[PDB]
Design a protein around this ligand. Structure first.
Ligand SMILES: c1ccc2c(c1)cc1ccc3cccc4ccc2c1c34
Lengths: 323, 289
DNA sequence: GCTTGTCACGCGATGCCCGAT
DNA sequence: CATCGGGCATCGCGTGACAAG
């Protein structure tokens, strides 16, 4: 042997002693490198130091064993109800903490994100914005960014959080800095899915097939209890639908018409439809409309390529429907 | 340049930066332990402190603390069948000014506004099975708008022990909602019924009266109107029905989002079913003055 | 078949310890 | 009370083996 190897071996022994103590599963620790071992040790220490100041059950009146068990996982229950992940970032743009669920949204391992620069995860076009959120002086924050997604590739996410002092960081003795405690959440079969609906002569629906109940979301009864079909139509398409209804009254066939229908979610769905008149003893009896749902891009393309220029043609809004 | 020498120097710089990172982390360690010397002693003291401190990185209470410090809110776990409150966090007291006794042994329908009860059912019957909505919760009875976001989970949860003589032992619910609740010169077109209820609202309303379409949809327009103008507005809506196709202009005052009165000119006409000539709804164009 | 990075090693320049001046 | 040379320990540098991707 030689003194250099013995010093390096003492250093590696202390590094392995640090590594075995980290609060991570053994399969995660065994795949770590010395540098990230030290980094995660520092991170655990700083987190414990902050919680040793900022931190510290079910109201005894309502305490049962099962309620205590639920209370012991309250934190994970909250993390799962988040629909996103937690992110605490220092003034130095370092990730003080990121919850495990970041892997379920971005693909990054919690062990690789902590104590790293947050800008490594932020898009280059949005980083500046983030910085202005890190620094006339109220506290609450809410904004939008785009973060790298390895499952995609980027993902736009809404950050809702606050600026609070990150105590117990022993900087040099400096006073504590202002860290961002934020919650990051995401943002909000068409190949021949043709469905047919039967209507009265005033376009009151009366019948609908399975794929129609799947597209629109109404039970066959719920579809007919809400009046005529003009209650289902976007206000930007009501006049086109009325025009094509007049056309079908005149000639028996409406022709292809693209318009928006209100679902049971109070959402809009583009449909390309064709209404035909059915006759009994030479008189009109009911209507048979054949619809094929459309993507948003195709719908807006048909809208910008419209032949008829009518009022409200370019309006966008929301609606509700009652019986 | 020379590929070999360039690669050699790049590699040397990589290793040098690695060494600098290691010494910096060791200095952070010495800053982060009780009393702190050379690298080996700092590492030994770090091992000792981490031993005394100590699988999740944070404890459950630390994670809950981080989330509640980030964006407030309180957790509740209800049953999908009856809405029976299975669990509610103590954070309900700082959020709704309500003790845990009010929610336990109760049902979420009993805690919300009656007008939202039906809405609640739509969110409980039967990406993941996420849920998110907005309701009004209790606190004379006072109510607050609460945004809820959660998920559908199979019951009972694994890990939690359920004794024989526990209240949950007889309920036998299969699915539960686990959620967090948190407190929170232009014109626009709209469609009402013949009573004045907003059934369609243009998105421009925010730039016109400060309200989102959800705050308008379902409500009557007369509720936003000034009492000295309410009968004028009502008679406008009544006369526009008798004169189908004809336009009717009416000026009134509108309670903006900031509880401020604006002057609005509304032009209303009626939409006729092109077959039965019946009144489908009333189209209004509401403009700022 | 190349890139980036992890780890061990050899190698001196100082560091600390400590009899011996 | 220092000051001084021993021998080992600490520590920063560059380089080569080796492997994940
Ligand atoms: C559910 C509810 C309403 C309608 C619908 C489905 C399908 C339609 C297909 C063509 C069509 C053409 C002219 C006017 C219409 C008015 C209402 C509806 C349709 C129309």
């Amino acid at each position: 042997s030689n003194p250099s190897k013995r010093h390096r071996d003492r250093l590696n022994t202390e590094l392995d002693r640090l590594a075995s103590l980290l609060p991570f599963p053994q399969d995660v620790i065994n795949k770590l490198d010395k540098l990230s071992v030290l980094r995660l040790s520092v991170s655990y220490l700083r987190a414990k130091s902050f919680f040793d100041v900022s931190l510290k059950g079910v109201q005894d009146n309502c305490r049962t064993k099962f309620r205590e068990g639920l209370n012991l996982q309250e934190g994970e229950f909250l993390l799962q109800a988040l629909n996103g992940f937690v992110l605490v970032v220092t003034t130095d743009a370092l990730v003080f903490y990121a919850s495990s669920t970041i892997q379920d949204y971005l693909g990054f391992q919690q062990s690789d994100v902590i104590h790293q620069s947050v800008y490594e995860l932020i898009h280059t076009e949005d980083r500046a914005e983030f910085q202005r959120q890190l620094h006339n002086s109220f506290m609450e924050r809410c904004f939008v960014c785009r973060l790298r997604c390895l499952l995609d590739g980027f993902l736009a996410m809404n950050f809702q959080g606050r600026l609070k002092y990150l105590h117990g960081q022993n900087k040099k003795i400096l006073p504590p800095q202002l860290a961002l405690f934020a919650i990051a959440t995401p943002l909000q079969r068409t190949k021949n899915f043709i469905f047919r609906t039967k209507h009265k002569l005033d376009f009151t629906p009366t019948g609908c097939d399975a794929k129609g109940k799947i597209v629109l979301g109404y039970t066959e009864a719920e579809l007919c209890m809400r009046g005529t079909g003009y209650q289902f139509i976007h206000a930007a398409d009501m006049l086109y639908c009325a025009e094509y209804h007049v056309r079908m009254i005149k000639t028996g066939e409406s022709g292809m018409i693209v318009f928006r229908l209100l679902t049971k979610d109070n959402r809009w769905t583009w449909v390309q439809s064709n209404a035909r008149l059915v006759y009994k003893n030479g008189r009109p009896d009911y209507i048979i409309a054949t619809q094929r749902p459309l993507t948003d891009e195709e719908g807006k393309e048909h809208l910008r390529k419209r032949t008829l220029k009518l009022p409200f043609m370019f309006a966008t809004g929301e609606a509700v429907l009652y019986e | 340049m020379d590929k070999e020498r360039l690669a050699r120097e790049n590699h040397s710089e990589i290793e040098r930066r690695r060494r600098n990172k290691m010494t910096a982390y060791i200095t952070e360690l010495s800053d982060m332990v009780p009393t702190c010397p050379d690298k080996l002693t700092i590492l030994r003291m770090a091992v000792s402190h981490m031993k005394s401190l100590r699988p999740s990185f944070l404890t459950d209470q630390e994670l809950k603390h981080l989330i509640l410090e980030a964006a407030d809110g309180f957790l509740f776990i209800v049953s999908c069948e009856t809405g029976r409150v299975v669990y509610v966090s103590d954070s309900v007291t700082p959020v709704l000014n309500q003790p845990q006794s009010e929610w336990f042994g109760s049902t979420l329908y009993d805690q919300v506004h009656p007008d939202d009860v039906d809405k609640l059912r739509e969110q409980l019957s039967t990406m993941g099975s996420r849920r998110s909505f907005i309701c009004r919760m209790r606190c004379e009875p006072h109510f607050v708008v609460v945004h809820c976001t959660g998920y559908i989970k199979a019951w009972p949860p694994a890990g939690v022990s359920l004794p024989d003589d526990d209240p949950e032992a007889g309920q036998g619910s299969k699915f539960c909602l686990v959620a967090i609740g948190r407190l929170q010169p232009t014109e626009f077109i709209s469609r009402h019924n013949i009573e004045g209820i907003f059934t369609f609202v243009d998105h421009r309303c925010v730039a016109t009266v400060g309200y989102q379409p959800q705050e308008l949809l379902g409500k009557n327009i007369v509720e936003f109107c000034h009492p000295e103008d309410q009968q004028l507005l009502r008679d406008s809506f009544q006369q526009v029905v008798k004169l189908k196709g004809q336009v009717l202009s009416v000026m009134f005052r509108f309670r903006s989002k900031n509880q401020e009165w604006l002057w609005m000119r509304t032009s209303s006409f009626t939409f006729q079913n092109p077959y039965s000539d019946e009144i489908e709804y009333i189209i209004c164009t509401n403009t700022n003055v």
